[PDB]
Amino acid sequence: MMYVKLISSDGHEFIVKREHALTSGTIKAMLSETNEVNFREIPSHVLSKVCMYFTYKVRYTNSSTEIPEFPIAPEIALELLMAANFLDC
Amino acid sequence: VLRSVNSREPSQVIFCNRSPRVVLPVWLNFDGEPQPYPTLPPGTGRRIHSYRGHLWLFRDAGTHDGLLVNQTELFVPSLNVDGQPIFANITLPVYTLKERCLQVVRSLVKPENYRRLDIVRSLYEDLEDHPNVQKDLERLTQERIAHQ
Amino acid sequence: MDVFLMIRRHKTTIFTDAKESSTVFELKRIVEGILKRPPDEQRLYKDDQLLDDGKTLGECGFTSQTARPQAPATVGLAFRADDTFEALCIEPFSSPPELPDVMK
Numbered sequence: 001m002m003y004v005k006l007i008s009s010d011g012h013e014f015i016v017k018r019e020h021a022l023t024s025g026t027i028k029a030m031l032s033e034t035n036e037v038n039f040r041e042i043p044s045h046v047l048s049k050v051c052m053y054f055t056y057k058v059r060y061t062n063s064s065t066e067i068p069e070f071p072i073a074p075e076i077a078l079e080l081l082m083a084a085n086f087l088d089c
Numbered sequence: 090v091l092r093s094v095n096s097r098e099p100s101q102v103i104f105c106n107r108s109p110r111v112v113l114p115v116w117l118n119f120d121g122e123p124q125p126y127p128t129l130p131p132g133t134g135r136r137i138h139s140y141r142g143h144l145w146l147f148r149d150a151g152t153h154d155g156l157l158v159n160q161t162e163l164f165v166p167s168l169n170v171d172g173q174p175i176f177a178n179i180t181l182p183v184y185t186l187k188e189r190c191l192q193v194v195r196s197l198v199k200p201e202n203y204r205r206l207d208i209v210r211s212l213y214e215d216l217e218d219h220p221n222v223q224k225d226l227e228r229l230t231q232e233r234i235a236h237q
Numbered sequence: 238m239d240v241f242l243m244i245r246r247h248k249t250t251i252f253t254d255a256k257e258s259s260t261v262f263e264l265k266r267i268v269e270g271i272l273k274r275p276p277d278e279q280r281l282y283k284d285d286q287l288l289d290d291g292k293t294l295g296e297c298g299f300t301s302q303t304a305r306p307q308a309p310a311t312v313g314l315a316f317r318a319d320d321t322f323e324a325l326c327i328e329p330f331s332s333p334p335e336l337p338d339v340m341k
């Protein structure tokens with residue numbers, strides 16, 4: 001079971017499964033030996049939510065079951081939009 | 090190209106909203122013009138009378154966000170075997186995080202104030218490009234053209 | 238049933254999933270593979286409560302209703318440092334900025 005580390009601008013280290021991080025085409029280009037990525041522009045309150053999106057996407061993609069809404073707090077929406085645009089996810 | 094075929098053969102369907110959105114069912118008329126039908130509140134179902142070979146798509150009634158029906162874009166009523174109605178299961182797609190973010194921002198900011206946001210110019214255009222049934226029908230016909 | 242978690246210690250957050258029927262000890266084996274610390278040098282928590290290795294995640298309150306992919310449940314982690322275990326400390330995420338006037 002392989003994992004990668006995504007580090008936020010404020011130093012928070014997020015360890016997610018490799019398969020999940022490969023959701024972001026941006027991350028896939030740099031990885032798919034190397035398993036550590038620094039995001040000097042993405043704070044932890046945003047990067048933590050990106051990691052939640054990866055789990056959500058892997059879980060619910062091609063699912064027959066009812067898919068729940070992905071929640072986004074108004075306060076993080078603008079920063080999350082910018083991160084998602086860079087990450088291509 | 091994308092239009093209902095005038096079969097005149099009745100087909101009963103269950104529109105089942107398995108999404109948290111208010112659903113706007115849209116029927117593509119004989120000329121390919123989208124025709125809106127009565128909305129469905131979240132988690133509700135309606136037994137409806139349609140026809141074989143007719144085309145339907147489903148949207149969020151308030152924002153026009155794209156929804157899936159039986160895990161795909163379009164639903165075509167078929168032949169009722171043993172009088173069983175056809176199930177049209179409407180669900181949320183797994184939106185990209187970018188599109189989901191655009192949906193949340195558009196819901197909080199009036200279109201007049203998009204240009205007042207502290208974001209790059211490209212994201213202003215992405216925000217202004219509201220989900221549109223006609224634009225999606227153009228995209229869908231273009232995609233069916235790539236298939237020789 | 239699957240449960241979705243965030244195992245947190247200081248400024249480290251592990252995103253992982255497990256079964257409701259899986260144990261607290263099995264979750265320590267996951268942390269061992271990532272942070273290279275054996276289960277006997279780890280303590281796991283649910284809020285300020287120490288969790289027993291033999292207890293299932295469901296018994297510890299980690300359920301499919303509360304540990305969702307889009308909103309995972311938090312499990313606290315404290316390592317052993319020389320003779321004693323350190324205090325459970327989880328660094329909070331950054332504070333979002335004030336909502337702009339056009340969003341209020």
Ligand SMILES: COCCOc1cc(-c2scnc2C)ccc1[C@H](C)NC(=O)[C@@H]1C[C@@H](O)CN1C(=O)[C@@H](c1cc(C)no1)C(C)C
Pocket residue numbers: 095097104114116126127128129135137138139140143
């Ligand atoms: C008189 O109108 C009452 C409302 O009609 C309806 C409401 C609802 C819905 S969709 C969500 N909630 C509700 C209740 C669904 C269906 C209907 C009505 C029966 N059913 C329809 O309107 C069906 C749906 C679609 O197949 C076109 N159609 C037709 O009847 C069309 C037609 C007739 C023949 C012959 N071939 O095509 C005409 C509009 C031109």
